Design a protein around this ligand. Structure first.
Ligand SMILES: *[C@@H]1O[C@H](CO)[C@@H](O)[C@H](O)[C@H]1NC(C)=O
Ligand SMILES: [Ca+2]
Lengths: 96, 48
């Protein structure tokens, strides 16, 4: 998980984290998903671009970004704060 | 007087089976089978 190892282990990325917030993910799996998404954001550097989306019968953005962002400390902080604020409700729709 | 009771007993058995296979989902979620059982319960209701 060190930045030097991560930069030497692969090329930069255009990552999109898709999060299921349908009704069935309510409970333990929702907190686990939040922690997992924060840890996954912790693996990204300034040369990667990330955005976190969320779908439950309708797909939207978790924050005020609406597109890929540089994923520096500030943008990752915003994405983490937005991810720690989601709730589970609705019906799953993988297509949208 | 016809064996109308046997078919009704089989119908109620099928209704109980449909009730058993229903999967309760949290926070207003559903799957294909649950949606398919919400339509089958119309068949039981009209027969009753
Ligand atoms: C995000 O968290 C704040 C608390 O600081 C809350 O007021 C707001 O409703 C949350 N956003 C959503 C979409 O729930
Ligand atoms: Ca689901």
């Amino acid at each position: 998980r060190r930045p030097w190892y991560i930069q030497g282990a692969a090329s930069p990325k255009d990552m999109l984290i898709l999060v299921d917030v349908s009704g069935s993910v309510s409970g333990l799996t929702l907190k686990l998903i939040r922690t997992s998404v924060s840890e996954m954001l912790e693996t990204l550097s300034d040369d990667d671009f990330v955005n976190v989306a969320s779908f439950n019968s309708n797909a939207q953005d978790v924050s005020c970004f609406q597109h890929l962002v540089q994923a520096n400390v500030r943008n990752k902080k915003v994405l983490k704060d937005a991810v720690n604020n989601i709730t589970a409700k609705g019906i799953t729709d993988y297509k949208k | 007087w016809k064996p109308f009771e046997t078919i009704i007993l089989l119908t109620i058995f099928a209704n109980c089976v449909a009730l058993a296979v229903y999967l309760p989902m949290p926070e207003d979620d559903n799957n294909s089978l649950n949606l398919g059982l919400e339509k089958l319960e119309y068949f039981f209701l009209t027969v009753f």
